[PDB]
């Protein structure tokens, strides 16, 4: 029996900064050898879908893997929700930053939504070392099984 768990937020930050994932998701489920706190790199993995660019780690026991999929999402006017390729319908306006909630929609769980200004993200997850890139606003949302992220952009500058 396989289950899915959303990485803890600190793990998300570690992956964004170093492309290194920590094992032993918290109760604990060790991947192998019962040791933990090992910075494991993410491999480019094998192509699955024309859009997904999945980066995995593994490539009565319990096996733990750590995936970072860069999918594509779409939204329609007036941009009150967006749906990724693998389902994942989110009731958050893609251009909703952290001030314009009366000019954009936001209906997801307010206790699981985080926006970080000037966030640093590795250019490529596959490469063990990459040139860190700064983004004006990056929004994170924690779900039951995964955590979604998406750069926030001005509405009147990308939509016509």
């Amino acid at each position, epitope marked *: 029996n396989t289950e899915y768990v959303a990485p803890p937020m600190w793990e998300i930050h570690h992956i964004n900064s170093h492309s290194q994932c920590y094992s032993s998701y918290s109760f604990v489920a060790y991947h192998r050898d019962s040791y933990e706190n090992k910075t494991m790199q993410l491999m480019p993995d094998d192509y699955s879908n024309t859009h997904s660019t999945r980066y995995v780690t593994v490539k009565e026991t319990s096996n733990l893997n750590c995936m970072v999929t860069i999918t594509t999402a779409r939204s329609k006017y007036p941009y009150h929700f967006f749906a990724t390729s693998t389902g994942d319908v989110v009731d958050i306006s893609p251009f909703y930053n952290g001030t314009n909630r*009366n000019a954009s929609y936001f209906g997801e769980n307010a206790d699981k939504f985080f926006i970080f200004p000037n966030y640093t993200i590795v250019s490529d997850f596959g490469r063990p070392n990459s040139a860190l890139e700064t983004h004006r606003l990056v929004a994170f949302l924690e779900r039951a099984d995964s955590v979604i992220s998406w750069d926030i952009q001005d509405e009147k500058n990308v939509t016509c």
Partner: antibody
Amino acid sequence: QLQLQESGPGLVKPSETLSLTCTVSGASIDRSTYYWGWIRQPPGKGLEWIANIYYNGRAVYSPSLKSRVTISVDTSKNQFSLKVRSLTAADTAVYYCATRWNYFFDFDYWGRGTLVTV
Amino acid sequence: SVLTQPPSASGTPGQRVTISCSGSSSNIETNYVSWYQQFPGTAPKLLIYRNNQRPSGVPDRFSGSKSGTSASLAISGLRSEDEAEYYCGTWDDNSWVFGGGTKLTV
């Protein structure tokens, strides 16, 4: 388009508690809202935060008013009410119904407060 | 955990006014500090949400800074309509502590 209004009594006496109610229009209390709260202000004095309440019923009070203050929320009517016990002359103030709407802003929307004289 | 905000401040049109809030070093030090503007006889309004950034619609004349356990609100080019009561606000371990309240006078 959040809108907050108050419907508390205009006159009170120390012999009874004070019950205030804040009603929300243009939106609804739900898991998509961060928190609401009550902030009092004596005439000519500084603002005083009484307590905050969340959608799931969790309430965090101020240590100075924790004993004499209770707060509840009715999601069916999209309202939340505050009860203050053992009123004194110092409680004559304008009570505001504040909340958090935007992510960064914090205390952003302030309902038109009601004057209560002890 | 009061912020020991001064009772009032004075200034002249075209001048810069600085308002200072002194923190407990356990709430203002780390928890974000916000500045609120309240005209007399009406509910207050958010003026500076985070320590540095400025909300939409607020004039650029307002600025905020947080050095150590002290918070400073700077107003440049003082005007007639700027007269109001300015409040500090911050979190103290699940407790919101407003400032004392400064009545700006021109």
